[PDB]
Amino acid sequence: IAHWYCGHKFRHRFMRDKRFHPSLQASHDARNRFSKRRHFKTNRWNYQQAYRDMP
Amino acid sequence: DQTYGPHKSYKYTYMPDPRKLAPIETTQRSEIVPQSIRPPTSYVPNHETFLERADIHRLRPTSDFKASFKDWNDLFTCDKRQLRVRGIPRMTRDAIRTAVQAFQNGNPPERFDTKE
Amino acid sequence: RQIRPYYNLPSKSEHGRKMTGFLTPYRHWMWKQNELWRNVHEAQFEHLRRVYKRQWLESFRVNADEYIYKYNITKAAQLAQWECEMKEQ
Amino acid sequence: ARAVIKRRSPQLWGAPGAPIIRMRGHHVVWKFQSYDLVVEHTHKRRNSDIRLLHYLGKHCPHPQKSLWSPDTPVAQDRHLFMLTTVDIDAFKYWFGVKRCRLSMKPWALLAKAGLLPPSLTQNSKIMPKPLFDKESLMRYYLANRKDEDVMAREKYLNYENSMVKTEEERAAERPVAPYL
Amino acid sequence: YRRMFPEMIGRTGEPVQQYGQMPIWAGPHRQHANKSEHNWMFAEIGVNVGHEALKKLELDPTNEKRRRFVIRQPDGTLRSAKMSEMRAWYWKEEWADFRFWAPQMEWGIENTPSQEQYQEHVPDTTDADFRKQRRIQSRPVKWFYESHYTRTGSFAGFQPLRFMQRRTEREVRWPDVINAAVQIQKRKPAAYIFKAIPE
Amino acid sequence: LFFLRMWFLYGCCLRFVLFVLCYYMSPRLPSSGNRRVLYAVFYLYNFVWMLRCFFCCFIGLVMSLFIIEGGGFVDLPGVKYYTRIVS
Amino acid sequence: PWWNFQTEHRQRCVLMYGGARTKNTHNANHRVFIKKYKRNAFPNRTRHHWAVSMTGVLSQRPRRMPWPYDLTSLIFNQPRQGSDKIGYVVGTSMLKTAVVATNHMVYYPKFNQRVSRTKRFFAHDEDLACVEGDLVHIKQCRKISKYKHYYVFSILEPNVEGRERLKLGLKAVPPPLFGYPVSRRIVKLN
Amino acid sequence: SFKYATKLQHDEMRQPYYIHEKRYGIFSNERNIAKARRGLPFITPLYTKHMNLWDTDT
Amino acid sequence: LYKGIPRPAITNLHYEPAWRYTLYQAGAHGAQLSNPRSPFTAKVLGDELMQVRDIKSVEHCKAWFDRLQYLINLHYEAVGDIGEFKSRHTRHVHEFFVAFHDALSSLDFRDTYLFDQFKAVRPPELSDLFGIFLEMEANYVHEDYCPRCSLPYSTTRYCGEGDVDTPFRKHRGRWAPHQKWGREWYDVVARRAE
Amino acid sequence: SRWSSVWPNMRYGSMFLSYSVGRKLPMKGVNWVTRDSNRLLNFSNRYSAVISDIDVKRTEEELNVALSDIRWNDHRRIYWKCSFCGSSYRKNVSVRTKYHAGCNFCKKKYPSEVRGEQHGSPPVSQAAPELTEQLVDNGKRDNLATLAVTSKFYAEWTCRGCGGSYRSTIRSRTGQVEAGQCTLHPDIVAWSAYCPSCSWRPNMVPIAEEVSRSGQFLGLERSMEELGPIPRRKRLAC
Amino acid sequence: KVDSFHANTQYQHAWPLLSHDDLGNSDQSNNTKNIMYSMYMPKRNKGTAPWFRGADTYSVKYCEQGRYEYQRYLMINRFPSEYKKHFLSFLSNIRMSSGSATIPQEALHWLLRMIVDNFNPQHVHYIAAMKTLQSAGELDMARDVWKIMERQQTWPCTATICAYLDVCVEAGEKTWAMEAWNRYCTELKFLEPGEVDPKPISRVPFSLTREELLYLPKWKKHFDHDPNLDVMDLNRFNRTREVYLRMAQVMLAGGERNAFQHFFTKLEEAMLNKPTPVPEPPNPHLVRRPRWAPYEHCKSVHHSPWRLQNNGRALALGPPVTIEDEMQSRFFSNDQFLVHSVKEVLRIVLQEHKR
RNA sequence: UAAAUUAUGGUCAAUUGUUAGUAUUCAUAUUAAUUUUUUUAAAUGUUUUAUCAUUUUAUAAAGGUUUAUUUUUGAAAGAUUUUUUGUAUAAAAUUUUAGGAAUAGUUAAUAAUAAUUUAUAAUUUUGAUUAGAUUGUUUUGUUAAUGCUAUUAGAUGGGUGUGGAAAAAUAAAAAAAAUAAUUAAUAUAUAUCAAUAAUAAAUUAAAUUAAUCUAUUAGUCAGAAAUGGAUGCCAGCCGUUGCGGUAAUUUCUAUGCUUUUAAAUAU
Ligand SMILES: [Mg+2]
Ligand SMILES: [Mg+2]
Ligand SMILES: [Mg+2]
Ligand SMILES: [Mg+2]
Ligand SMILES: [Mg+2]
Ligand SMILES: [Mg+2]
Ligand SMILES: [Mg+2]
Ligand SMILES: [Mg+2]
Ligand SMILES: [Mg+2]
Ligand SMILES: [Mg+2]
Ligand SMILES: [Mg+2]
Ligand SMILES: [Mg+2]
Ligand SMILES: [Mg+2]
Ligand SMILES: [Zn+2]
Ligand SMILES: [Zn+2]
Ligand SMILES: [Zn+2]
């Protein structure tokens, strides 16, 4: 591992590689991989009545 | 970290090959097509008149080199390398040699002076 | 280039080129002669052009239809193989 | 058609022009230098590969001793050798069908090979260029001219179709009894 | 063997034949041209030719797509290539069959020249090489007195480990003195002394 | 290998610097003495950086610019660069 | 000659026998990152660049390369790659325009495994058959508008539930409950 | 399996040229070579993939 | 089975041999004379044109043989002095002969056409060739000359002096003194003859 | 300048160059002395010819090398004057003794290099004795008349027309070549009759003649008069 | 590839080792054997044994192979638009590739090339090639076209049969027309009162139900335009009487009275007692629908002051050769076609007399 | 759910660091490079023509682009006596930053419409747009090896729009409409980024044409190789454990001695 890529440590390289790993990729189940925590508890106090046009 | 330089110096023997030193059958190309020199015309009587009528370009100042040739045969006996020995600059000596071989082909150095 | 000799018709002009290509009749005759000689060369040259053209066309016929022979046999074989695999299917 | 012409490497017509067979190699010390016979366009770009139609061959302009063949007391074979690789199917295609152009040096080569007659620029300065007058030429022509049909058929065989069918292969190709 | 397998010694070859010349319309004016200093070999290349896999099929005189060679002799004629000259245009082939007599093998003691064998120049004298453990050498022409069936081939197909090996490394890092096992050599002295040597 | 010690070589093996100060610093125990440290300057992309390096060199008649090379570690903590020659 | 050692070299101009004529590009350069910004203020909202950035595409490790072999090429013989696509219709807000979500394939040779990515297309349905949630076949064609190169070739599966849902005057599909994520906290009560 | 087989500059390691003909027709590239913008950086893509791997047909 | 497309007619070509054609012959393309030794070519060219054709190979072979009998007649008595500092060496003839024999028998140069010419080209006095070499072995054994290089004892100090083709003196090597006759070299000559 | 550094061309004849420090150094460590065993003059029983080929005047002048100091194997390059053709050259004794190397002209002395004496051609003194007088006179003209009439020897002749001296080949002068060698130019005999400078005028006579006759010149003329039973193949034209 | 300092194309085919002069190992005089093996020859990696590329490295089985047997069937499909473009291109190339530069044989070349490129040579191409070749007076190559079509198992339509029978008659070979007849046109009928006159096009053209699309193998879904599929619908206009006429001409040309009498009698009878079939409109592909142009900018008739220049707007020169002033043969009534048929037979009598 | 043989076939995968309790790809090794050396480049005036004009001569200036760059024959090739055709500008894949939020002359339909046509529009968390860095999809190095690690360079908007095609304002090494020339590859002293020269680095001599060059380093505790003399926690050594406290085989100096001989050292 060339030392100039990513951080000054080695493990930073493998931490950004986990971003490209095949079986780790973003889909309908696993979402917002890179910032999970900025979006957390965001809608707790947002009250949305669900959509029903059928009785 | 590699400060030490190469591990070995690989060198091969020189051992002369009896097969590569074997006599080579030779021909001289002057035998196949004989060389000759065209005698001067009334148009071009001297080597200096020649260098005068081959002078066209501003940068091919042929006429300035008249002294570096002793006679007629001296001119047509010159080739480019030996023509460099005598200290003629580059594109000038190409103009000269071109002119000479052209005269040899049956085309005399008749061309309009472009300097003006 | 087009050679412009010194005995071509001199144009007296200060606004343009000093020498117009216009020929002494001698120059015209001369030019005609030289050009006849090179005509002699290019006759054989283009003769060889079209000769090689038909050579290449003919070889293309023969090899290409040999190719079509072998190839058609191949694709006939493949097609047979397939409809068989589908009967089995 | 460039406003400020590229002065050093002019050509004729627009680029890319008709394909021309050239000899070219990178310049180096004379001891190692080779050339490439290449069909390419008239206007080259920086790297010669951009317009390159076909690669005709390598030509090495160094007379060589033949160490591949056994040393042969025959006089002529022990002259030095000059090695060249010609691709002649592509050559005959390009030259013949596509109607190429030719620089002079490749022409000299392919003349040596027997693909082309010697070039226009190869001059024994011994002989002059010939003279001509039409009445003498006419006397020679009236003296020898072949028959019209003979000539027409020769032009037929050289230019148009060569391979023809003798009556025999006709008779051998025409259907037999059940469909005859 | 000779009686039972007559076809194992080739007695036949494709004859060297002269090609007909193409007519030059320019006549004598150009006749000087194709007559020159040297021989000119021309081997064909293309999509159908030059592939080692197919080599024999391409040198086969029966095949009509056979690769074409030609040679201009210095007098201007043209002839077909001798079989040697044909084979010159393929990557070099090594034939040695070990099954009856030993083929001569490269990188031996009497084979390898000095600088590869030892890192020093060693004089080649035909008498008494102590390094090569020979007493004397009479030096006849190699394949002359020996029987021809005995000559088998040569084998270069291995690494010459005294000389050059793969993945070269220091055998021992300390002390600083040892190198890879290919560097064997005597010590060079403090500055050289030259004794005049007619003696 | 420690790649962050080389920060001011900026991917180069050697550097050119100008002399400014020369002061003395005491090494990490149990090594006592005075280690001579030269405080140098150089510029890259029109930024002027102050480099701080170990003076092992030989000073003759008064001179200005040195040649900086990176080493292994030395007695003195915090000083990565060493001096090759003085010009 | 790339197979010869450092010391074994004589001429640099030619290959004597054969092999590959190779230019050595110097791979180890110790290239470095210049730091022009304070860690506090970096002039981008979403991302920050603190180190040497790997560059190229396909020169990018770990390599991710186009995979021709997937469902779409499995079913179709395509004259040109991407000339056929099977997908679902997502939304019709535009007249004679069906948006279509489609999957394609990427291969990681390092790990020897495939991933499915997804991409949206604008397809041209004249006559407006496609209801959101249709399974459609889609083809490459004439340039139609700025972004539409694709047209709806065939409906594989129509949406029967969605069509009957429309017939009753209701939207084809209920509108998604939440939109895109935010970095704020919205306090909205009653 | 070794380094020499990494170098595709040999013609023995590289899928041959003619494949691209077999897919797009013979003498098809001579057209492409005369194109206005060529080889800076890009040329009309040259498809050479061993014919048993073709996604289209197989 | 019968769903999806009709069965391509060309399939028939598999089961029916009637449809396997080649419209043209092998060389009808203009290459017919490629095979120099085919009966077709012998019929087209006729015999005297084939003679004209192979004359060059015939004179190749005759050239080899002529060189060989020149060298034999020159060096036949093995020991003499034929030139200024140069004297006869059987070894010359030997090595040439080996060049010849390699032209024929080797698998690197394999020029075998040379051997098709022997029934004609080959000189009647050279038929016995190894016999002539044995005679040379008998002449090689003279006492005034060194048993190894065959240079004269009186006028020469070393093996290989003033010989162009000598094996015994190599480039940076050393000179070897003349070796003397005795049972060693006697049975060397003997084993060679054998 | 820069280009001074370029290695010269080494043609096929020449062995090892010694142009590099590595190639020079090990021979720089060889120091020769002339003893009684090394001295050329002791060995005249063998090398007598080699002794009588040395330039005794010129070597001691230019090289400061006495003739008693010259080893039979001597590596130094000294001046020679060929006792056959009489031309001067500079070589080392070692190379003339170890193999035969000597004046470069007498390399081409025989009609073909490949086969040295194999010629069956008569000498010049016989076939064309009228040539022997045109040789520039160095006193060696009796040795040069001894050569083959087919010989490729490069000799100098005094031109008939201008009385000056030029250099051509014996076989080029006679016109005759040996069977199996390369044919020369058909006109070579007429063209080498004179100087390269004096040759043009005489050979332009028949051309002016042929344009005087017919008012038209084509080089064709010779081949035409060559025209005023040939086996030929069956053709596929039909 | 070429001309660069690092140029690989020049090294990619085999060459004998070059020693002209000193290449750094002093190659002019030096025996390079070990230098050859350990240095000059490419190796697998630095220090490994030399990698041998020679003929002995490959197996024997490369030379056991017949030609072109390494090829596999290639299904290449392409857009419908592109099929039209390509078929047109091949058509106009078969007509003529170059202006005076076209050899007759070139039509044959282009048909063959069309096959080599994995296209199906449709009926238009065959008719065009045959008419071109025959009009160049080259009759063997015409039959060669036919044999190509037979080898591709393409069922000739009625039009194609006509063309090939024209080639047969002009060649005067009856034995061709007989096999052609026997194989293809046998069941060819005439048109009667109960017949329906020009038959509608009945073909579906080819589609896929979603189950056909998904569940079938790759080849069953592969549609290349194949001549055989519409052969029925090329024949929908009943050109039969032409075939019978041509066949009469052949049987006459080959000098056989009974067979000729047969065909000509069948034809005569049908022409008298059966309805006249509806003629087919002009084929879009063989002859092109005239496109609208203004004729305004044109060299005037008198444009050159020295002569009469013919012009695109009108012909001032006059007809060079007399034309018969009759519509194309298919537009005739049945009685008219009877007359035409007799004049045709006479013409063949004349031609045979001249041969 | 059975073995197999008419016997080595279808052509070579093979890994070398003297460490310091133990856990963890991390100093000192080899190969490849930068450190390092003037044996391959080059000078200005492009050229015809019908005369103040008109024909020929189309991708190396910079800027920094990651959903990005895409095209014809009407020029030339090119062959007939004149009207000659159709196919093109579109797309699909692969796209970087440790810690991540909104973007915008804006989508789609109409049409040779609309600076105010119609509409429930378009891009984004499957990571957008700005912003940093960066010349994109046959080129390298290491390696037994899925890897890791390189690859230059070249397409920067419009504004009388010429031309077949804008590629159009020094910087060739492309013969440019009569064979300028091919006995030519040599170009003197300049440059840019390349292009690996310590080429038998030491004893028998160069089948020459004798031309360029006069050519050296390191260690000396551990681990090949030591003694005097100073110095005294100082001066200094330091790849690393560590050394220096009047006896230092570890500093400095002198002399010897050691090396497996394209150098040490730095990155
Ligand atoms: Mg290094
Ligand atoms: Mg760093
Ligand atoms: Mg420390
Ligand atoms: Mg690798
Ligand atoms: Mg630019
Ligand atoms: Mg940016
Ligand atoms: Mg894309
Ligand atoms: Mg696009
Ligand atoms: Mg502007
Ligand atoms: Mg020790
Ligand atoms: Mg120290
Ligand atoms: Mg003290
Ligand atoms: Mg001490
Ligand atoms: Zn002896
Ligand atoms: Zn002499
Ligand atoms: Zn004279």
- Its sign, for the CA torsion J39, J43, J47, J50, is positive
How many Å does it take to go from CA J14 to C1' L156?
59
Residues 6+ apart with CB under 8 A from E122: E114, E129, E131
Experimental method: cryo-EM
Longest Cα–Cα distance of chain E, Å, equals 81
8 Å CB contact of B25 and D128: no
What token pair was written down for E18?
A: 């002269």
8 Å CB contact of E91 and K58: no
Are residues F40 and F18 in contact, defined by beta-carbon separation less than 8 angstroms? yes
Nearest to J194 by CA among B106, B46, B34, B102: B34
- The 3-state secondary structure of chain D, one letter per residue: CCCCCCCCCCCCCCCCCCCEEEEECCCCCCCCCCEEEEEECCCCCCCCCCCCCEEEEEECCCCECCCCCCCCCCCHHHCCEEEEEECHHHHHHHHHHCCCEECHHHHHHHHHHCCCCCCCCCCCCCCCCCCCCHHHHHHHHHHCCCCHHHHHHHHHHHHCCCCCCCHHHHHHHCCCCCCC
Are residues J121 and J111 in contact, defined by beta-carbon separation less than 8 angstroms? yes
Angle at the Cα of E184 (from E183 to E188), degrees rounded to 5? Answer: 100
CA–CA dist K329, K337 (Å, integer): 7
CA–CA dist I173, E126 (Å, integer): 9
Asked whether residue I146 is marked as a ligand-binding residue, the answer is yes
Can you tell me whether residue F47 is helix, strand or coil? strand
Helices (H) and strands (E) in chain I, counts: 8, 0
Nearest to E143 by CA among A6, K138, I102, K121: I102
Q: Is G40 left (phi over 0), alpha (psi -120 to 50) or beta?
A: alpha
Output the CA–CA distances (angstroms, integers) from residue D27 to D20, E157, K11, K227, K353, in the order listed: 21, 36, 17, 57, 72
Q: Give me the helices (H) in J156-213, please.
A: 170-174, 188-191, 200-203, 205-213
What token pair was written down for D99?
A: 């109607």
CA–CA dist G170, A51 (Å, integer): 12
What token pair was written down for D3?
A: 């406003």
Residues 6+ apart with CB under 8 A from K243: K158, K161, K162, K165, K185, K188
Residues of G in contact with H55 (CB under 8 A): 68-69, 73, 78, 81
How many Å does it take to go from CA J64 to C1' L195?
44
Are residues E25 and C46 in contact, defined by beta-carbon separation less than 8 angstroms? no
8 Å CB contact of H55 and G22: no
Are residues B11 and J162 in contact, defined by beta-carbon separation less than 8 angstroms? no
Can you tell me whether residue K234 is helix, strand or coil? helix
Are residues J157 and J173 in contact, defined by beta-carbon separation less than 8 angstroms? yes
Which pairing describes strands G135-145 and G148-157: parallel, antiparallel, or unpaired? Answer: antiparallel
Residues 6+ apart with CB under 8 A from D58: D34, D35, D36, D37, D84, D85, K10, K13, K15
Residue type, J125: S
Name the resolution in angstroms: 3.3
Q: What phi and psi, each to the nearest 5 degrees, are found at residue G25?
A: -90, 140
Are residues D117 and C52 in contact, defined by beta-carbon separation less than 8 angstroms? no
CA–CA dist K117, C68 (Å, integer): 10
Rg (CA), chain I: 30
Residues 6+ apart with CB under 8 A from K123: K154, K156, K157, K159, K160, K227, K234
Residues of B in contact with K32 (CB under 8 A): 17
- Chain L nucleotides near the protein (CB, 7 A): 9-19, 25-35, 38-53, 56-60, 66, 68-73, 75-80, 82-83, 85-102, 107-110, 119-155, 162-189, 194-215, 219, 223-225, 233-244, 257-267
Nearest to E82 by CA among J148, D74, G16: D74
Q: Is J148 exposed, middle or buried (0-12, 13-18, 19+ CB in 10 A)?
A: buried
CA–CA dist A31, I65 (Å, integer): 90
What token pair was written down for F24?
A: 């003395």
Which residues precede a break in chain E, with C-to-N distance above 2.5 Å?
none
Rg (CA), chain G: 27
Nearest to B111 by CA among C7, K182, K178, K222: C7
What token pair was written down for G102?
A: 């489609």
Number of the ligand closest to the Cα of J193 = 16
- Its sign, for the CA torsion J180, J185, J190, J193, is negative
- Its sign, for the CA torsion K213, K216, K219, K224, is negative
DSSP J40: G
CA–CA dist I9, K24 (Å, integer): 66
Residues 6+ apart with CB under 8 A from B13: E113, E114, E115, E116, K34
* K52, closest nucleotide (Cα–C1'): L11
Chain K residues with CB within 8 Å of chain C CB: 66-69, 71-73, 103, 105-106, 108-109, 112-113, 115-116, 148, 151-152, 217, 219
Asked whether residue I61 is marked as a ligand-binding residue, the answer is no
CA–CA dist F77, F72 (Å, integer): 12
Q: What phi and psi, each to the nearest 5 degrees, are found at residue D24?
A: -150, 145
Are residues I184 and B37 in contact, defined by beta-carbon separation less than 8 angstroms? no
Q: How far is CA I52 from the centre of its chain?
A: 23
Residues 6+ apart with CB under 8 A from I40: I32
Longest Cα–Cα distance of chain G, Å, equals 87
Query: Mind giving me the DSSP string for E90-137?
Result: S-------TTSSPPEESS-TTTS-HHHHSSS-----SB--TTTT-SB-
Where b means 16+ CB within 10 Å and e means fewer, J123-147 reads ebeeebeebeebbbeeebbebbbeb
Dihedral over alpha carbons I86, I88, I94, I95 (to 10 degrees) = 0
Residues of C in contact with D130 (CB under 8 A): 37
What token pair was written down for J11?
A: 């043609």
DSSP J3: G
Angle at the Cα of E33 (from E29 to E34), degrees rounded to 5? Answer: 130
DSSP G82: T
Tokens 């000498």 sit at which residue? J123
How far apart are the CA of D15 and the centre of ligand 5, in A? 18
How far apart are the CA of G6 and the centre of ligand 2, in A? 26
Which residues precede a break in chain H, with C-to-N distance above 2.5 Å?
none
Give the residue with minimal CA–C1' separation from L27.
F1
Residue type, J61: E
Helix axis angle, K257-273 to K334-354, nearest 10°: 160
Asked whether residue J182 is marked as a ligand-binding residue, the answer is no
Nearest to K345 by CA among K258, K263, K271, K277: K263
